[PDB]
A paper describes a structure:
Echovirus 3 (E3), a serotype of HEV-B, first isolated in 1953, leads to highly contagious and severe diseases in humans, such as aseptic meningitis, myocarditis, and anicteric hepatitis. In line with many other HEV-Bs, E3 utilizes CD55 for viral attachment and FcRn for viral uncoating, gaining efficient entry into the host cells. Following rounds of purifications and analyses, three types of particles were identified, one containing significant amounts of viral RNA characterized as mature virus (or full particle, F-particle) and the other two being empty inside with substantially different sizes defined as expanded and compact empty particles (EE- and EC-particles). A number of key structural elements, including the VP1 BC, DE loops and C-terminus, the VP2 EF loop and VP3 EF, GH loops, contribute to the serotype-specific antigenic sites and construct the “canyon”, where many HEV receptors often bind.
Of these, the one named 5G3, exhibited tight binding to E3 with a KD of 0.25 nM as determined by surface plasmon resonance (SPR) and potent neutralizing activity against E3 (a 50% neutralizing concentration (Neut50) value of ~ 0.3 nM). To decipher the bona fide epitopes on E3 targeted by 5G3, we determined the cryo-EM structures of 5G3 in complex with E3 F- and EE-particles at 3.9 Å and 4.1 Å, respectively. The higher resolution structure of E3 F-particle-5G3 was used to analyze the detailed virus–antibody interactions. 5G3 binds to the viral surface along the edges of the pentameric building blocks of the virus adjacent to two-fold axes in a similar position to that observed for R10 antibody bound to hepatitis A virus. The light chain and heavy chain variable domains contribute ~ 64.2% and ~ 35.8% of the protein–protein interactions, respectively, with the light chain predominantly binding VP1. The 5G3 epitope contains residues 283–287 and 292 in VP1 C-terminus as well as residues 140 and 143 in VP3. Disordered in the apo structure, VP1 C-terminus (residues 275–292) in the complex structure, however, inserts into a highly hydrophobic cleft constructed by LCDR1, LCDR3, and HCDR2. These hydrophobic interactions thereby dominate the virus–antibody recognition and this tight binding are further facilitated by a number of hydrogen bonds. Notably, none of the residues comprising the epitopes are conserved (0/7) across HEV-Bs, suggesting that 5G3 is a serotype-specific neutralizing antibody. Therefore, 5G3 could potently neutralize E3 infection via blocking the interactions with its two receptors.
Residue numbers in the entry:
A (entry chain A): 10 to 292
B (entry chain C): 1 to 238
C (entry chain F): 4 to 82, 82A, 82B, 82C, 83 to 112
D (entry chain B): 11 to 261
E (entry chain L): 1 to 115
F (entry chain D): 2 to 13, 24 to 68
Write the structure that this text describes.
């Protein structure tokens, strides 16, 4: 393909002054030695390609980002709907993949996978028609609904999606909605110009919330649900690569960690894996 | 209208498909793109950059900087192995946490030649020579300079130039090797033995230090994307 | 190989045992073995000379401390907090990673 | 070759044992083109009065030291006119040129790593809490790393092999870096351009990048030699400009 | 820890009787670099310091007869005593070169049986 | 606007057609076929170009 890898031109014996093996890293330069410089090699036509490791093919796979549950019963109206400030730090599998790059600019596909489970107790439902969920997106500053059966579920401007159960998972696309020119994954700075407030990327995260509710009162019985959101970035560009994270995450608004070792442990410095008897090489 | 027939595989949700989708907010005006320096067009542009290799990660060394330093002394020697480790850039205690292994563990297959750069961090007056051998997986790992000098080996002299890139070639019977290797796709061993020894003038430090580097050559390739067995969690992070 | 014939020690105290021979230090470590009539031979530890390494058996870690300097041609082993269980014949041996070879005579340590 | 001479403004820097000049991620510092500008107002551009070398404070490389880090451009709060145009303007933009230098005798030995970590966000010492500005960068001195874990309640985690960011210290060589190997080298230069997501930003609430120095092969010598090997850092802003003139602030 | 078993722990035998004695290891004292078992055989004469019998588990020493011969491989061994004489009544200890704790075996006490 | 292109096959009727139905640029499919690469920015960010055969210093 267009990502084809370089071929090895053949090479015979040599006796020269141009030593390609000897270099000097103090210049901060990774050597470009192909195996043809330290031994005799043969002309092979290498047909391997690097398509599977481009950025778009490396990131264009949906991964879970949130897991919220909610009821349709009565009382404690904080349980009839679910809230989520849009973050990409609560599920680790995707956070670590994003934290290899400093800046990111992309579009996005969002697919919602909702599963509903009936709840125990007396006065069960016997038969219940299909359920219907509403998923309203509230930009930063919109009127937040306080419970189900509230005025703000009109969504006269907010993008809202209605999904009856028993239908293909819902999906819509969102363009690059950042304020700046790239989603800053890291922000070494403060919020107030007096160097106080909230330190970290927690201040750049202004994307709004996502609210979900049942449009069905039911009356006869309780039925919980489980909302699962999936992010799939496409048309993606990345800048300023980073070293991958080592210590496990602890908080969803910080980079905090605990000091962990650099790798696992071997038995000795010169331990090839097998069990060795004592001697003047391995001891 | 037009008569259709729903094929198997409808109403399903594949995570790695390429479908169009209606946009939530139409006619959105996106902010312009500016030329931020350092665009990454492919992940091998990251995997081709050197990174230090903790080859001294034995017992209580992983909780210090000592994991990165190889101790060398200037005694008789000639009978001592400086270091030996398998060639397993995906599953090995040596360089699974380097820059190369972290990108590798995101995949299942790999291929191509891997470089190894050795830097001498001794005094300015200390000389010496070393034999950096690589053995293909045909027999047991070498144990004296005799049995190691046969395989692919380079001889390294320290001078004004303080680096020698032992370039481990790609010798295998499969076009790709598994990341989490086994007996079948084993790759071999990499050792390093004294050839003359450290000689220092009076007043110089008798012991020196070598660091190891690792990167992928310009024929490296990768396939079969997967999730990394390196990061985990229990519940949501709040 | 020369080792002193016997040592008389008071319990809850230390003993320093010496070993000395024509052999020099190339790749040969110094082995120390504790021999008691009721039981078999028990290894205490060794001290190789090429890397100047010191090794002790878990059982004897904290009980046996052994030191050797190049000039005396003598290897030493010290034991502390002696009890009747330490009364035994202690042998020093050589090892060129080829065999345990020979030991020689020993100190009949008596804790009395 | 082995001889370099960098002249900026009214200050020159001569070196007789240099490796090379690694130039950021490829680009070279420049002024803001008008395709990308968003500031409505005319920008001031002090060329000579700002783009010159400033010598920071000196540190002492001991046999037991483990690392240091400065945060830019906060490290130049009180450095000539650049520290005035930081206080008098709301927006700032500039590239830097970090020259770090350490000479010791051919008979010493050691190594260093000179990285420029863009957006080096750091983690607290006590999880479930947050850092304070007095802990990230002092007024002019260099902050140190620690060999063991940091136990404070409001400080940064200063353990070295995690580099205080959560990454492995070995994998830091992605960012622009050189090595001060006392065997062959004497200094190390890095030309870092302006790396940020917004074209211009206020340079008080945003440390653009962090400069780190980590010794991998520690310093050891003999009693005949001198036992005071210092390190000095000299940076020079390049092609600086500002917008949004206000009253003096954060002074 | 590698332990060394000895069976029988002791046996009394008369003159001119071929005796053996097994020394079985809890781990195969044979490495695949040179294929040389790491086992040592030792004779401690009654009230005497021990001496070498068989090193590399295969080779004899000087001043030692063919009634002392190493034999075996892997993790099970024995020392064939072909024609016993009046200098074999003693205790014999096997030993391994492989694991750092150099534990000796249980110790066979070849006993002398008279008229 | 039938944009016929080449599919992805292993090197030794391979074309596919794709229309864009929606009136937004973000509603298109992914660009799984852009394979540019330039490791020069990271592998060799040197002001003085270094040749392999020549010595470094
Ligand atoms: C009921 C209809 C719901 C429609 C849902 C669309 C709302 C989602 C759009 C916001 C997501 C943009 C991508 C998010 C990226 C992160 O915020 C950045 N990586 C962190 O700053
Ligand atoms: C080129 O794009 C001109 C169109 C010729 C092909 C028409 C394909 C069928 C109609 C488009 C799909 C239906 C969209 C509602």
């Amino acid at each position: 393909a267009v990502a084809r890898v370089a071929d090895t031109m053949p090479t015979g014996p040599r006796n020269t002054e141009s030593v390609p093996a000897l270099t000097a890293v103090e210049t901060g330069h990774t050597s470009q030695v192909v195996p043809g410089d330290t031994m005799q090699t043969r002309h092979v036509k290498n047909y391997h390609s690097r398509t599977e490791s481009s950025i778009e093919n490396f990131l264009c796979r949906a991964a879970c980002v949130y897991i919220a549950t909610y009821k349709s019963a009565g009382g404690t109206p904080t349980e009839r709907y679910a809230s989520w400030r849009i973050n990409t730090r609560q599920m680790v599998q995707l956070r670590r993949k994003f934290e290899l790059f400093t800046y990111l600019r992309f579009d996005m596909e969002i697919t919602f996978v909702i599963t509903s489970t009936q709840d125990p107790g007396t006065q069960l439902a016997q038969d219940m028609p299909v359920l219907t969920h509403q998923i309203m997106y509230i930009p930063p500053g919109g009127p937040v609904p306080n419970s189900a059966t509230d005025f703000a579920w009109q969504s006269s401007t907010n993008p809202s999606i209605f999904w009856t159960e028993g239908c293909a998972p819902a999906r819509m696309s969102v363009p690059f909605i950042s304020i700046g020119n790239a989603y800053s994954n890291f922000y070494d700075g403060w919020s107030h110009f007096t160097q106080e407030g909230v330190y970290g990327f927690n201040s750049l995260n202004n994307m709004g919330h996502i609210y979900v509710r049942h449009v069905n009162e039911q009356s006869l019985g309780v039925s919980t649900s489980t909302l699962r959101v999936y992010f799939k970035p496409k048309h993606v560009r990345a800048w300023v690569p980073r070293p991958p994270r080592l210590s496990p995450y602890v908080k969803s608004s910080n980079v905090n960690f605990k000091p962990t070792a650099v790798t696992t442990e071997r038995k000795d410095i010169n331990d090839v894996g097998t069990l060795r008897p004592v001697g003047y090489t391995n001891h | 209208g037009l008569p259709t027939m729903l094929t198997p595989g409808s109403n399903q949700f594949l995570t790695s498909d390429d479908f169009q989708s209606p946009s939530a907010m139409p006619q959105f005006d996106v902010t312009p793109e500016m030329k931020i320096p350092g665009e990454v067009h492919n992940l091998m542009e990251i995997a081709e950059v050197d990174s230090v290799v903790p080859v001294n990660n034995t017992k209580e060394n992983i909780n210090s900087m000592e994991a990165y330093r190889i101790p060398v002394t200037g005694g008789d020697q000639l009978h001592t192995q400086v270091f030996g480790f398998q060639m397993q850039p995906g599953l090995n205690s040596v360089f699974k946490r380097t820059l190369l292994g972290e990108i590798l563990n995101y995949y299942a297959h790999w291929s191509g030649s891997v470089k190894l750069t050795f830097v001498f961090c001794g005094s300015a007056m200390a000389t010496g020579k070393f034999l950096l051998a690589y053995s293909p997986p045909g027999a047991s790992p070498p144990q004296n300079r005799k049995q190691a000098m046969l395989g692919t080996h380079v001889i390294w002299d320290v001078g004004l130039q303080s680096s020698c890139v032992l370039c481990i070639p790609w010798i295998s019977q499969t076009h790709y090797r598994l990341v989490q290797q086994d007996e079948y796709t084993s790759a071999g061993y990499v050792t390093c033995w004294y050839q003359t020894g450290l000689i220092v003038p009076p007043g110089a430090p008798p012991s020196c230090t070598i660091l190891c580097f690792a990167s992928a050559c310009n024929d490296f390739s990768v396939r079969m994307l997967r999730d990394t067995p390196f990061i985990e969690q229990t519940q949501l992070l709040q | 190989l020369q080792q002193s014939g016997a040592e008389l020690a008071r319990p809850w105290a230390s003993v320093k045992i010496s070993c000395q021979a024509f052999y020099t230090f190339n790749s040969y470590g110094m082995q120390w073995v504790k021999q008691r009539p009721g039981q078999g031979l028990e290894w205490i530890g060794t001290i190789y000379p090429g890397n100047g390494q010191t090794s002790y058996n878990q059982r004897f870690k904290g009980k046996a401390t052994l030191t050797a300097d190049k000039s005396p041609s003598t290897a030493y082993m010290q034991l502390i907090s002696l009890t009747s269980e330490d009364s035994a014949g202690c042998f020093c041996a050589v090892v060129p990673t080829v065999d345990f070879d020979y030991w020689g005579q020993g100190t009949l340590v008596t804790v009395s | 070759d082995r001889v370099r001479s960098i002249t900026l403004g009214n200050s020159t820097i001569t070196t007789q044992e240099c490796a090379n000049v690694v130039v950021g991620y490829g680009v070279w510092p420049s002024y803001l083109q008008d395709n990308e500008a968003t500031a409505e107002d005319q920008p001031t551009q002090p060329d000579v009065a700002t783009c010159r070398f400033y010598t920071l404070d000196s540190i002492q490389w001991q046999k037991e030291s483990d690392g240091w880090w400065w945060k830019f451009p906060e490290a130049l709060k009180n450095m000539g006119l650049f520290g005035q145009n930081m206080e008098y303007h709301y927006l700032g933009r500039s590239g830097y040129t970090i020259h770090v230098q350490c000479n010791a005798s051919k008979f010493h030995q050691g190594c260093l790593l000179v990285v420029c970590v863009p957006e080096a966000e750091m983690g607290c010492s006590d999880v479930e809490r947050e850092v304070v500005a007095a802990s990230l960068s002092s007024e002019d001195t260099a902050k140190s790393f620690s060999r063991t874990e940091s136990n404070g309640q409001h400080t940064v985690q200063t353990v070295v092999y995690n580099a205080g960011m959560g990454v492995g210290v070995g994998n830091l060589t992605i960012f622009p870096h050189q090595w001060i190997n006392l065997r062959t080298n004497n200094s190390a230069t890095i030309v870092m351009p302006y790396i940020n997501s917004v074209p211009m930003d206020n340079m008080f609430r945003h440390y653009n990048f962090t400069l780190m120095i980590i010794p991998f092969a520690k310093l050891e010598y003999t009693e005949q030699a001198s036992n005071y090997v210092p390190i000095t850092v000299t940076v020079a802003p390049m092609c600086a400009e500002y917008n949004g003139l206000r009253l003096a602030s954060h002074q | 820890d590698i332990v060394m078993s000895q069976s029988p722990s002791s046996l009394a035998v008369s003159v001119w009787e071929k005796v053996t004695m097994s020394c079985k290891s809890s781990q195969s004292l044979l490495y695949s670099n040179t294929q040389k078992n790491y086992l040592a055989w030792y004779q401690q004469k009654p009230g005497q310091s021990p001496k070498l019998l068989i090193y590399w588990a295969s080779t004899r020493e000087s001043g030692v007869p063919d009634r002392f011969t190493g034999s075996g491989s892997g993790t099970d061994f024995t020392l064939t005593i072909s024609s016993v004489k009046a200098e074999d009544l003693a205790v014999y200890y096997c030993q391994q070169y492989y694991s750092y704790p150099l534990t000796f075996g249980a110790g066979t006490k070849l006993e002398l049986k008279r008229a | 606007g039938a944009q016929v292109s080449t599919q992805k096959t292993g090197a030794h009727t391979i074309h596919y057609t794709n229309i864009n139905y929606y009136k937004d640029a973000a509603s298109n499919s992914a660009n799984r076929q852009d394979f540019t690469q330039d490791p020069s920015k990271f592998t060799e960010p040197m002001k003085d170009v270094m040749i392999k055969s020549l010595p470094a210093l």
